[PDB]
Amino acid sequence: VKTLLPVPSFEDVSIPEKPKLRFIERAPLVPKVRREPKNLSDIRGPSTEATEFTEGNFAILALGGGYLHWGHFEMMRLTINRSMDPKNMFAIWRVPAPFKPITRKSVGHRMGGGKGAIDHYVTPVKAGRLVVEMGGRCEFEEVQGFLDQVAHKLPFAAKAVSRGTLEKMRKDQEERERNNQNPWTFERIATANMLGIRKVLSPYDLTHKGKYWGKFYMPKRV
């Protein structure tokens, strides 16, 4: 007598009118003229926006910083819209369209002579941000297949998550910090400037606490 179990019901779930992912344009509506500095600190450190679920239940979590160009959005859109069931699924963008202009100098030219011309636009992404959010009448195993396929093609370390796996991920990190048997931690040493260690550290290391190096995120660091 193999024991059967109840099944969750999604009858209470609603599907929007346009479940598929909308089209993202190469450049913004009005082209920008003022050229901008490189400002690499927009992909450095933890994300402080779009870190929580809003409407759906499933998403792709960014485990590192990077820039999404239009080529990346097309890969995400087509791959997801093709692999999803419009009747029982829906997806939304958790990142804005490319807005940061990237200049390039014409090939073959020497250093100097001013700044290059705007070539393309990108969307900066920080570690810990949700890139795409999905939901509807579906389990995690259904979407996780093609969501991980998309996450693997992103320019940064990414991974498909759910409301549960994300929560467990965060509680597992807190558990490691509490039961850590090492009496020495990066935070304690850095904040107290022990050994004069702040002479080889960055001012941001006071907040990143050794979990971040450039655009890379190290989840095994406590």
Binding site: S106, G108, H109, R110, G112, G113, G114, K115
Partner: peptide, 18 residues
């Protein structure tokens, strides 16, 4: 050796007022 461009931003060379 391709001929390059020039910067179109002039001025902006004032010293600090102290």
């Amino acid at each position: 050796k391709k001929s390059g461009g020039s910067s179109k931003n002039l001025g902006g060379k004032s010293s600090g007022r102290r």
